[PDB]
Amino acid sequence: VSVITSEMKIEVRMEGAVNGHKFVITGKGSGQPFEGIQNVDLTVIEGGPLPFAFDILTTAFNRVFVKYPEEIVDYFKQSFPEGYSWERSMSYEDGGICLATNNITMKKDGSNCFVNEIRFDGVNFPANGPVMQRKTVKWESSTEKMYVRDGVLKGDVNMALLLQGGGHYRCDFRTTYKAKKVVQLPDYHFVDHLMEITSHDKDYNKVKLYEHAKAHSGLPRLAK
Amino acid sequence: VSVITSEMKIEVRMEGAVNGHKFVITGKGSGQPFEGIQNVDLTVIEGGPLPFAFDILTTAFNRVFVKYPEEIVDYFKQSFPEGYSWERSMSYEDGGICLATNNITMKKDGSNCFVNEIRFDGVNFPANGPVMQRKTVKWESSTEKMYVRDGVLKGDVNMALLLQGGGHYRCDFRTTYKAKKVVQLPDYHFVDHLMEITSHDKDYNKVKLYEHAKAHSGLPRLA
Ligand SMILES: [Mg+2]
Ligand SMILES: [Mg+2]
Ligand code: NA
Ligand code: NA
Numbered sequence: 282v283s284v285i286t287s288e289m290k291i292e293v294r295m296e297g298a299v300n301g302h303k304f305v306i307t308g309k310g311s312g313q314p315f316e317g318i319q320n321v322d323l324t325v326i327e328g329g330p331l332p333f334a335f336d337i338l339t340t341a342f343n344r345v346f347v348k349y350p351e352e353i354v355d356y357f358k359q360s361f362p363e364g365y366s367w368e369r370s371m372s373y374e375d376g377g378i379c380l381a382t383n384n385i386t387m388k389k390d391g392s393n394c395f396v397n398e399i400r401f402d403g404v405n406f407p408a409n410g411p412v413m414q415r416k417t418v419k420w421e422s423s424t425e426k427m428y429v430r431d432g433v434l435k436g437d438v439n440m441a442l443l444l445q446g447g448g449h450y451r452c453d454f455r456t457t458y459k460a461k462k463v464v465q466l467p468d469y470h471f472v473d474h475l476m477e478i479t480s481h482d483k484d485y486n487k488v489k490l491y492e493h494a495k496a497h498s499g500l501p502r503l504a505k
Numbered sequence: 506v507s508v509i510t511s512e513m514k515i516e517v518r519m520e521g522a523v524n525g526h527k528f529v530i531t532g533k534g535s536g537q538p539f540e541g542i543q544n545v546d547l548t549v550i551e552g553g554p555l556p557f558a559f560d561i562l563t564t565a566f567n568r569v570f571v572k573y574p575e576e577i578v579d580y581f582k583q584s585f586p587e588g589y590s591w592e593r594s595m596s597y598e599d600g601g602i603c604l605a606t607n608n609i610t611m612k613k614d615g616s617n618c619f620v621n622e623i624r625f626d627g628v629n630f631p632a633n634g635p636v637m638q639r640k641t642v643k644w645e646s647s648t649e650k651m652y653v654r655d656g657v658l659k660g661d662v663n664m665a666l667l668l669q670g671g672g673h674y675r676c677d678f679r680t681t682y683k684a685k686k687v688v689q690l691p692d693y694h695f696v697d698h699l700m701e702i703t704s705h706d707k708d709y710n711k712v713k714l715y716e717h718a719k720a721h722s723g724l725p726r727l728a
Contacts, residue, residue, distance in 0.1 A: 298606065298624060300592060300606075301590060301606050366525060368524060368525065368628035370600075370602045370628060370629055376679065378594045378602075378604060380602060380603075380627070381628075382525050384525065400525075402604050402624065403604070404604045404605075404606060405592050405593075405594055405679060407655060408655060408657075409655060431632060431633060432632075433632075457628075457629050
């Protein structure tokens with residue numbers, strides 16, 4: 282039995298460091314779990330102005346916000362109210378790498394709100410690279426490949442940041458999702474993602490995010 | 506001009522998380538910079554008993570402790586008293602990965618002591634793997650390859666943990682060393698490392714480490 286409802290709130294707190302630069306970001310938002318859409322408004326409360334591209338942080342601020350078709354098992358919505366956590370490695374093509382974790386739970390009170398405890402760390406970003414030089418434009422849309430491994434769920438996705446001077450900067454995501462209770466495990470499937478920073482101030486001390494995600498079984502064998 | 510001396514003290518503080526498990530470790534030690542040897546006594550003050558193999562943490566608690574021959578430029582000893590910092594990725598063959606940083610400086614009280622601020626984070630270690638199951642025995646010795654890149658120093662090394670059931674568990678280290686002031690840059694070279702946990706209690710809440718390291722230019726061309 283799922284306790285998820287059409288309109289739920291979001292609360293997040295991220296603490297971390299990139300190339301040794303510490304920072305803390307908090308935020309609030311809301312999402313529609315069944316429609317696979319969400320909004321998050323963030324504020325850098327420590328470490329601002331950030332010396333690195335804010336884009337590397339955006340995907341770390343909840344797969345519960347994915348429109349899952351009836352035919353595919355939804356690992357995430359089943360996990361609440363207890364929730365789940367995730368671990369992720371993000372390996373960039375120039376050697377830069379980031380690791381992040383998120384522990385997600387629902388508030389005891391019937392406020393229908395998700396709480397996110399996030400840790401984010403990145404190292405080895407070249408001084409002349411697009412991340413430290415803040416030359417990124419946006420993340421392209423993507424399709425995450427979901428598969429079960431040793432009783433938990435894994436998600437791998439080829440990501441790419443469009444750069445100011447044109448061209449792309451690739452990053453490989455490897456995520457492990459762990460429900461806090463026994464839930465039904467899904468067969469191999471996919472999750473399409475589309476996101477964007479809908480608003481931000483000069484130094485990205487204030488940032489608004491939007492994400493739309495939908496699960497599917499891939500291209501059908503027959504054309505048309 | 507180098508301000509390094511034959512006997513120097515070490516103070517370390519590591520805070521981090523592995524697979525979401527938070528922990529804090531502090532310690533004190535001493536080393537002989539010119540001989541390339543050091544000892545560090547560690548104590549887990551938060552998060553114990555650690556659910557993961559302590560071995561993954563050991564190399565994160567200072568390349569200043571390396572015997573450098575006169576012929577090779579010493580990037581590390583030159584950097585003090587200001588010091589330097591390093592960033593490192595440790596990629597294991599089963600997907601587990603750790604990132605660590607260390608900001609190193611000398612106290613300005615003339616006590617010949619290095620202070621180390623360390624952050625350590627690891628994720629994606631399989632529940633049935635040797636790290637979460639604590640099936641590691643020790644790190645094998647190694648040879649780090651040092652090379653300059655964009656004005657700073659990089660160090661890459663093929664590491665391996667011997668496992669209890671026999672066999673090895675490989676990890677690739679990628680480190681970037683950044684001096685806090687302008688220092689002479691070295692040509693491509695190598696640093697041999699030999700380390701060992703000389704003592705530890707049952708759950709590794711108390712651990713003693715020893716490391717020996719020496720820089721060199723590789724095998725001579727002539728036999
Ligand atoms: Mg922008
Ligand atoms: Mg042992
Ligand atoms: Na399914
Ligand atoms: Na040299």
